[PDB]
Write a protein that binds this ligand. Structure first.
Ligand SMILES: *[C][C@](*)([N]C(=O)[C]([C])[N]C(=O)OC([C])([C])[C])N(*)(*)(*)(*)[C@](*)(*)=O
Ligand SMILES: [Ca+2]
Length: 240
């Protein structure tokens, strides 16, 4: 997250860190959202490589024991049927990960609330992005979870010429674009939390930023719109 502030430990308990095995250690590569005790939602492009993956829930400082983490393996990866690696602008950047065991819920580990199917937010709706991604374009990862206030940019504005044009589709949510705050590499797969009827719900899965940089004016961070995929999500959990 560029232009973030550090999050409190218990503020976003459905956030997870998706990590892959890297020699004798594990390395953060993406975020995700815990949606069931044994299912995580993340972006399909985070699991394009055929690596060994684990999920860490109750995480706050990547490099330190916090006394709250649980570590669990990924047993099955279901990416969207229509995802295409060579075409992230087409959408469908979403995947669900079945965990090897069910995690224990507590004040640090909770399920993410999903929106109702079809829900579209009004422009400039209050949302927060969270993650351990780069804190500057071409910088390095954060050690502790960061958050940034990122209001939505609706489809009509985001698909206009000066913003993303044809690259953004209506299956996506745009948020931010002020040139200071944004998602960045390593935040991919993570939540966009938006306040709706006094409750935070996860309306986006972080998908992409500009090739020019993470925080670029009029190039808001782009998210997979979760409410376009509620039927698919529920069909996969009900049979896997
Ligand atoms: C999948 C991708 N993640 C990264 O690019 C990672 C987290 N960045 C990284 O490993 O650190 C340096 C900057 C290469 C040292 N994008 C979305 O999360
Ligand atoms: Ca830790």
């Amino acid at each position: 997250v560029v232009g973030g502030t550090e999050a409190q430990r218990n503020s976003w308990p459905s956030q997870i860190s998706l990590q892959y095995r890297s020699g004798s250690s594990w390395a953060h590569t993406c975020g995700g959202t815990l949606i069931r005790q044994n299912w995580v939602m993340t972006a399909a492009h985070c699991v394009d490589r055929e690596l060994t993956f684990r999920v860490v829930v109750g995480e706050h400082n990547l490099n330190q024991n916090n006394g709250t983490e649980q570590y669990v393996g990924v047993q099955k990866i279901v990416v969207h049927p229509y995802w295409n690696t060579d075409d992230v602008a087409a959408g469908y950047d979403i995947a669900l990960l079945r965990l090897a065991q069910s995690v224990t819920l507590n004040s640090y580990v909770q399920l993410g609330v999903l929106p109702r199917a079809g829900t579209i937010l009004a422009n400039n709706s209050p949302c927060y992005i969270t993650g351990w991604g780069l804190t500057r374009t071409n910088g390095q990862l954060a050690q502790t979870l960061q958050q940034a206030y990122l209001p939505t940019v609706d489809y009509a504005i985001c698909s206009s010429s000066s913003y993303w044009g044809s690259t953004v589709k209506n299956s996506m949510v745009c948020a931010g674009g002020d040139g200071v705050r944004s998602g960045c590499q390593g935040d991919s797969g993570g939540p966009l939390h938006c306040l709706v009827n006094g409750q935070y719900a996860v309306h986006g899965v972080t998908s992409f930023v500009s090739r020019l940089g993470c925080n670029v004016t009029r190039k808001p961070t782009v998210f997979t719109r979760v409410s376009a995929y509620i039927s698919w999500i529920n069909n996969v959990i009900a049979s896997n």
